Amino acid sequence: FRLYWDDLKRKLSEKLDSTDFTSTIKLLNENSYVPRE
Amino acid sequence: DSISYSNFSVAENFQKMKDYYKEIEKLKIKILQLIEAIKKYQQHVEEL
């Protein structure tokens, strides 16, 4: 089958519901990356 | 992890405190030689 607009909206809400951004923002502040000129 | 965050700014604070203490050493030298000057000056005006 095909996918229309409302399927893409609810699927982005489902798949974006799970992940957590907080660890990645914590990872980009690690001692291996903290000064970045 | 929070102390690992705080190091970045604490280092600059300690650096500036070191700079001001170097200024204190220079002003100690200046105040010493000026007071010695004033002592020889009072010897001079006592000569006058």
Residue A19 to residues A14, A16, A25, B45: CA-CA distances in angstroms? Answer: 10, 6, 13, 86
Q: For B1-48, give the secondary structure using H, E and C.
A: CHHHHHHHHHHHHHHHHHHHHHHHHHHHHHHHHHHHHHHHHHHHHHHC
Q: Give the resolution in Å.
A: 3.8
Distance from CA of A31 to the nearest CA of B (A): 7
Task: Tell me if B5 and A29 make a contact (CB, 8 A cut-off).
Answer: yes
Distance from CA of B22 to the nearest CA of A (A): 28
Q: Is residue A35 within 8 Å of residue B7, measured between CB atoms?
A: no
What the block records as the tokens of B36 is 């010695």
Experimental technique behind these coordinates: cryo-EM
For residues A6-29, one letter each, b for 16 or more C-beta atoms within 10 angstroms of the residue's C-beta and e for the rest, the string is: eeeeeeeeeeeeeeeeeeeeeeee
Q: For A1-37, give the secondary structure using H, E and C.
A: CCCCHHHHHHHHHHHHHHCCCHHHHHHCCCCCCCCCC
Residue B4 makes CB contacts below 8 A (sequence gap 6+) with A31, A34
- Does A24 touch chain B if contact means CB atoms closer than 8 Å? no
- Does A34 touch chain B if contact means CB atoms closer than 8 Å? yes
